[PDB]
Design a protein around this nucleic acid. Sequence first.
RNA 1: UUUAUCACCGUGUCCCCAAUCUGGAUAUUUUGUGUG
DNA 2: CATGTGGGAAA
Lengths: 299, 299, 299, 107, 85, 111, 106
Amino acid sequence: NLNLFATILTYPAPASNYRGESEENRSVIQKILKDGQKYAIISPESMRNALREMLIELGQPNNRTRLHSEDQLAVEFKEYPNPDKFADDFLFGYMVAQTNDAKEMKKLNRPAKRDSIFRCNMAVAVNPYKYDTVFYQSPLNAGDSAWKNSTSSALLHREVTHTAFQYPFALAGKDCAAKPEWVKALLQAIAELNGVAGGHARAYYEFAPRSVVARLTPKLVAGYQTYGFDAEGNWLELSRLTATDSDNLDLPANEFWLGGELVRKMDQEQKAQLEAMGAHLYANPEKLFADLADSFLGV
Amino acid sequence: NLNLFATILTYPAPASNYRGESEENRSVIQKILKDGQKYAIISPESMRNALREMLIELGQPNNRTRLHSEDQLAVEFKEYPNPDKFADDFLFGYMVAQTNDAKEMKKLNRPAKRDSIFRCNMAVAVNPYKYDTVFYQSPLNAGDSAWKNSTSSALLHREVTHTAFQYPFALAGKDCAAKPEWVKALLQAIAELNGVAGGHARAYYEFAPRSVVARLTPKLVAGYQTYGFDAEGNWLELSRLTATDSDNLDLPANEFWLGGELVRKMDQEQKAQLEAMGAHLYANPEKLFADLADSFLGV
Amino acid sequence: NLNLFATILTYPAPASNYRGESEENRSVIQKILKDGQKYAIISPESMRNALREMLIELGQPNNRTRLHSEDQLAVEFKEYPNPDKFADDFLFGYMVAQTNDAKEMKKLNRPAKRDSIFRCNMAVAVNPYKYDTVFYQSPLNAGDSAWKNSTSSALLHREVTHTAFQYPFALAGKDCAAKPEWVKALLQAIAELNGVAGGHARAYYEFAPRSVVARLTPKLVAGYQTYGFDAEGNWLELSRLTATDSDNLDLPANEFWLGGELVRKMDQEQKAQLEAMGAHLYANPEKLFADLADSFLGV
Amino acid sequence: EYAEIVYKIAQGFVLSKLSSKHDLQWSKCKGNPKLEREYNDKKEKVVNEAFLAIRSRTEKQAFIDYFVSTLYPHVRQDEFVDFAQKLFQDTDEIRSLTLLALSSQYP
Amino acid sequence: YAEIVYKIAQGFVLSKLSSKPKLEREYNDKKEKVVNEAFLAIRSRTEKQAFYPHVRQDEFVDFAQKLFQDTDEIRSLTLLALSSQ
Amino acid sequence: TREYAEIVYKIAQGFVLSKLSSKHDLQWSKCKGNPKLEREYNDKKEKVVNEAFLAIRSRTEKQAFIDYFVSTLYPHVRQDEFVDFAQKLFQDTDEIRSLTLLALSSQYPIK
Amino acid sequence: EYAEIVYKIAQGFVLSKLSSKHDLQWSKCKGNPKLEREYNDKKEKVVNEAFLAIRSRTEKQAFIDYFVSTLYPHVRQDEFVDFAQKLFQDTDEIRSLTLLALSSQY
RNA sequence: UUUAUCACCGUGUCCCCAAUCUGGAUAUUUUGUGUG
DNA sequence: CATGTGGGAAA
């Protein structure tokens, strides 16, 4: 009961969140895999920034905040980083100094701090990239100055994919009694989140949890899942032989399994037998993932 | 109370709004979806300019106006942009900065406008594209040779489809100080908009009335819907689950069900059972908006 | 009966685990193979560190502990490393000597640690490297001038690969006095490995479950294997000739193989016939190390 | 001659388009410098239009669909067969070859 | 088998030309330019329009070949006919 | 090729000069008598050459280097030897990448 | 002749890198002894790290790509192509000259 | 120009990071002329 | 310690 693994899905929608740049007026999208096709990715640190923004939104005191200032990207820090503070997002970071005062403010905490109790991984579009593009025309020219932009107008390009994508994450039960409410707030933020995409006014979609399929175990942060579903989402077949006989034949236990939206499928005869072992009677992901907090955490 | 998720309303009719250019003299339309078929789209920025024009026709003091001048696509920027601008810049827009003059515009506000309160998304034809086309044009030549156009008389092609399309959008509440007087007009503009196409002399197309299933609760910008109807406009594929629920047991908790042009479908008995907890008493989308705009706001 | 040979591989997942260094702002990865392609590797000492950490996880006394202190990489070294140290020093590690004090530390033990019972080798990506990268971040500054880090906001790069890789290991069974208590901890640890990476804040990657082929023979350290699987992972084609002639034709006998996760392949006919020779029954690799560790050991 | 064919077809295409738009046989330009200026302006307009048209689309089927339709290569009566049979790497390389050939012709 | 497409295109174009001294040269040059109108109509096709050594075997075999790589056939009639004029 | 090395140097310097002249309508012919013009001239040259150098050095690969070089760079005008130089280029490109890096980095103004 | 230009390249690299990183020049260094001490020790550190970095990776591609660093100091106007061709071909004596030039500055 | 000889023993490259802010491909147009 | 250049092809 000292480790938690999970993978979550989202609803299909047109894509966004360009990262690369090119003079050719095309905002390229990051890609990784070469199995004969191409996929799209979303880096995890952007989602970490979104989590920090949401913990800003909810009522949790934290010492890091982003400010809009001179064109250099900047974020002020005010008080020195400290383990014993209402701040947990401000807890994760570690930064070195040439001076570093007198032994890190005279032996109060310790500068190089662990990553976090939370660990994540990139997302995969689970749908091959397609060469479709969208074409738009941006006129930038004024007849009365008013500090206009570049003189000549231009025509630009974007690209977009209609897909949905998933990513795994995990955490450990090393230190949880010290931060019960912090973990509760973090889980509440995970249950539903906003942003994580560069383009707000265009191509709006959010990472609403489509399915959660994992639980806690005293197996010392080990797993069996491959962290990948099929196109339709009914991945449980690759784990069907893993879940049907959870009680016997040296198979992974029933306590490790859950159900999100896929459990609401029309067929229910096998739901009766899976309910005889696993606790998966949850249809709404939010209620289930909130209920998981009480079981996983000390309280 | 602080978030608003809404849906879309359109009628089927022949299509318009070409963007591509083929040297073979065809006005190709944009296709992005890849599920074995093609789908027609309209960029959200077209709708943004349409909304700007709709605000223009009503009394709304703005800084941006379109002018017809030298062949470069020019936009009259009027005086210097203001963030407390009475029509658009506060509502949605940006104040440019190439060098941002001296001392931040002589100590005036903040140049970059991060927030775009109207947050929309691309449209989808939800009807497979066919390669049907029509060449109804036989261009002409000048006979009296007075200020002649291109000498040759060519033949070109055009393609249109019988389709109805939707575009999801949503918004949240930011600051009620100046929010009402502009947002109430914005909702009226959403309820009734025009254009969003170059071609109106031919293929006059408007998408003002149809069913709307808009949805607002303080769930912190969470969306359970899929943002998609069926072929015949019956959203019921979700109305069996998130609408029949009565927030009493083992069901999603909701209290803000809304209807539209679909409430008058053939069956009526289940409308009575949905009336026990829902607010789908609106035949007119206009009447629905007139009430839900006041409900979403403070008063 | 006195030797144990095995090779372990992993599930596919995007893995960066940067190890190299470069001013070119790209965290290079290690490549060793030369066949016209590049393969990523993981050096064995990282796996040794992970094994030490896991021995720390279970109740196991140790003399070596990593401390978090001044920027120089340092180890708290605690007591003299004696060969009769319960978990770490006896199993592996060495007792260095510069002065060797006086009269050989009061004529105690031996500063020549020659045996390292755990024999380990590096891993091979068995997937060609791709020149893809990720444009994942830009460093940003501080605005309130508190604990000010580097002056400017820099840009850099990183590269990732979607890969799964295997490694061999071996050990010789000689001692049975103190080993049976500690060896069982090693086998349990091998089944579960956690770490072996630069930073798990991003691209946390674990390689716990997959097919395994352990082999114990009284052949005095001899292996017919090649220590390599296919791209799909069906290395067992070489044993097809070996299994058929277990009884006759002057070829290895029926008790000549062990199974793993790969047994759950779709076909079943030859698995029924292969059961007559080898112990191809363990579907879960973690269960395999529970039994065959007993047979190899005294009990 | 492989790449020479690409160079010749690009040069012939640009000359043919320039002749269709404006009078051919550049030698008639002769002394009047304004004729050279307008000729160069039209030349660079056509060339950069083609450059943009080929640059924005360089992805497999669409690239060849635009390339074969809007360009007029030589006859290559029987030598064309080898040019057709190795079409995959041919396209993979002639994207760069055609871009280079088009970029080569500026005033 | 590209040469087969070249041969059939050239032969069929000459067949239409025959169906209906600088005078001889200009006549052939202008007539071949006229036949190009049929090709621009054919190359306006997308998937479905307008559907020598032997007849029995091709229908048994080439019919299968036509329907699997029809996307390839688009270059044949376009590239080959244009090369003539 | 030494001839192609001279070609690379010439096209690099020509691209730099032409892009500077087109983008910020600035000519070195007005150098004399306007030292402040010399400061903003050197500033613009720094900006453009630094951007180009970082972009070219950012990644190394066959297809990426080749298509970036053929797209974002405009080679000089020569009649026929382009076929020979290109065909020699396509077997081996790393030396060409190093040579174009040398030519582009040589353009930094002194002090 | 190229030995002198290589030495000048290394010297210019060291001085320009130090001046860019920590805004220090020779005259103000001559100002007060503490500034000689600080500037001198930092110069030792930077030249030492450069020498340690360059002492390894002894082959064609590795040495060329590590030469790509230092921003090709003071290459100046390319009046001579022989350096680009013959010296790239030799690729051995250049490493020795660069090592000697870097070691000469301490 | 003869005769013999393990370069041997140990070692996490590790700690933090958003490609960010705005953008109607718009403008015009008889497949027309005929027939047991 | 710094910028430079043209023109065709087929039964």
